[PDB]
Write a protein that binds this ligand. Structure first.
Ligand SMILES: *CC(=O)Nc1cccc([C@@H](OCCN2CCCCC2)c2cc3nccc(C(=O)O)c3s2)c1
Ligand SMILES: [Mn+2]
Length: 299
């Protein structure tokens, strides 16, 4: 049976007045978005920050991902070093060869349907690479920053100072007595179901490239998801602590939905934000070559 797409999560298109600061805006949409776990935010059309990464020196060794590693229960090691350009050439070549069509012509529903088929397939072993958890301290943030390590044009200063610049999000949690991370995706590269440390918010910006497909669960269903996950996880992993079990928490959203867990989806396109709410489980995969930046923040 083919994959059944979950219902779409909320998308907000704030006016320039509503777009003044993200913390106030997120607070206002909370009564709705908290009930879906994730939401998408489309900035005004004229809000277009420039890409400020040091592309000439951008080099990384992505992690290798075998889509059916869990159902299939011979080592592929992270030895291939890429540049942004060489990874993109590999990524586009992989996708165009896999689907036998230009990368921009593959429907998002088809990649989604094929991703979940491959995750459970025992006869077909598809292996991809993900440039995940690249620190913005290594080659700079995708957003312009007033660091002095790179030049900022006068038309770019407003983005260096914008509250929607992920480098300007509040990250200090209140108690008695962090930098954004970068993600260089390719088709089928993915992240498993998880929540954030300290049940923190997270905000995610797709700088460019093909969409990032998300799945989200509202926080009121967090314990229901955890029960389903442990009931259906392999018995060898069933008793592992949450922080370790999250390393293998691959699960088809339809399986969660069949067990009563509400799940929402979205395709995050270039230039759009995705916000995850406290204790909102989320997962996803990339439709193709793209570049994302993310940070956890607190209210
Ligand atoms: C099962 C599995 O392998 N899951 C997986 C794979 C790759 C990367 C990640 C995870 O990266 C760790 C997050 N990082 C920052 C926070 C502290 C721990 C280290 C990812 C988590 C998210 N969350 C939202 C979006 C994305 C994304 O766009 O890739 C990711 S990646 C988990
Ligand atoms: Mn996350």
């Amino acid at each position: 049976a083919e994959f059944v797409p979950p219902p779409e999560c909320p998308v907000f298109e704030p006016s320039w007045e509503e777009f003044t600061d993200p913390l106030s805006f997120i607070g206002r949409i909370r009564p709705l978005a908290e009930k879906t776990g994730i939401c998408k935010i489309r900035p005004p059309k004229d809000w277009q920050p420039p890409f400020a990464c040091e592309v000439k020196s951008f080099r990384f060794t992505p992690r290798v991902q075998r889509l059916n590693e869990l159902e299939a229960m011979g080592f592929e090691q992270a030895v291939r070093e890429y540049t942004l350009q060489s990874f993109g050439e590999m990524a586009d070549n992989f996708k165009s060869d896999y689907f036998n069509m230009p990368v921009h012509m593959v429907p998002t529903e088809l990649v989604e349907k094929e991703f979940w088929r491959l995750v459970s397939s025992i006869e077909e072993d598809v292996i991809v690479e993900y440039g995940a958890d690249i620190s913005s301290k290594d080659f700079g943030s995708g957003f312009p920053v007033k660091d002095g390590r790179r030049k900022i044009l006068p038309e770019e200063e407003e983005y260096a100072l914008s509250g929607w610049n992920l480098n300007n999000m509040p990250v200090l949690e209140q108690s008695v007595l962090k930098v954004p991370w970068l993600y260089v995706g390719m088709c089928f590269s993915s992240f498993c179901w998880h929540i954030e440390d300290h049940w923190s918010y997270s905000i995610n910006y797709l700088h460019w490239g093909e969409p990032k497909t998300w799945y989200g669960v509202p926080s009121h269903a967090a314990e229901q998801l955890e029960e389903v996950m442990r009931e259906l996880a392999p018995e060898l992993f069933e008793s592992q602590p949450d922080l370790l079990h999250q390393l293998v928490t691959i699960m088809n959203p339809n399986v969660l939905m069949e067990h009563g867990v509400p799940v929402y989806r979205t395709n995050q396109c270039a230039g759009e934000f995705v916000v995850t709410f406290p204790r909102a489980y989320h997962s996803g995969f990339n439709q193709g070559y793209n570049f994302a930046e993310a940070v956890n923040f607190c209210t």
